[PDB]
Structures are given as structure tokens and as C-alpha cells.
Amino acid sequence: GSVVGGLGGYMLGSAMSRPMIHFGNDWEDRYYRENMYRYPNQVYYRPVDQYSNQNNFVHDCVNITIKQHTVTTTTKGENFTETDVKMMERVVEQMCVTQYQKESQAYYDGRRSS
């Protein structure tokens, strides 16, 4: 259990089932579904109380995930190239689309820590 791996007021987003996303190119589709589990199961994001955008959430959500899991893993052996990042972007983006909704929804409804 961590402080987000030490980010500036972000949160981590607990591991979730990777979504199926399609890419039009059959090789991207096949490469994605072959390799979905190389990518992180989690995403990273900012508390919506400050801003609650979709665009600024997902635009940072991706880059932040594609940085953290490219920092705390390239520190070991990782280095996801452009092709791999394209898949990872989508995987963490489509997972991000939920994460924003949860943060917001929670603050709109369950805003109490229960």
C-alpha cells in the first residue's frame, strides 16, 4: 500500500480487467489482444474535486500512467516502445474513462467516505 509511488497529489487506480479495444488494423487488434497483460492493470489520476474534467483527466491519466509504469519499471528492465505505448495508451485510457466517472460519481453521491 503506497502513496501512488510518490506523485504530486495523484492517486493510483486499483487493478481492473483489461478492456477489449479495437484498432482497425488487424495486426494492432491481434498485437493488443496477444499482449494486454504486459501493460499495467491499473491507471493514475488526479482527484476530481479540484477540476472534474474528462479531457484533462484522460489526457493526464494516460501520460502519467505511461510515465509511472515507464519509470518504476524501466528502473528494472522495461522500455515500452511506440507500438507498445499505443496499446498501453488505449488500455489505460479506456480504464481511465471509468476511473473519472467513479471519482466524480463518488463525489456526487458517496461523497462521505461512506
Q: Whole-angstrom Cα distance, residue 33 to residue 49?
A: 35
Let me know: does 35 contact 87? Beta carbons within 8 Å. yes
**Residue 31 DSSP class:** H
The alpha carbons of the chain give a radius of gyration, in whole angstroms, of 15
Cβ-based neighbour number of residue 78 at 10 Å: 13
40 closest CA partner among 73, 10, 4: 73
DSSP-assigned letters across all residues of 50-104: G---SHHHHHHHHHHHHHHTTTTTTTTT----HHHHHHHHHHHHHHHHHHHHHHH
Cell reading at 7 = 506523485
Please report the domains of the chain, with CATH numbers, ordered by start residue. 1-114 (1.10.790.10)
Q: Whole-angstrom Cα distance, residue 90 to residue 96?
A: 9
Q: Whole-angstrom Cα distance, residue 67 to residue 69?
A: 6
Q: Whole-angstrom Cα distance, residue 4 to residue 22?
A: 29
38 closest CA partner among 84, 71, 81, 83: 84
Q: Whole-angstrom Cα distance, residue 93 to residue 19?
A: 10
Residues contacting 40, CB < 8 A, separation 6+: 15, 65, 69, 88, 91, 92
The experimental method is: NMR
39 closest CA partner among 62, 22, 11, 55: 62
Task: Give phi and psi for 98, each to the nearest 5.
Answer: -65, -50
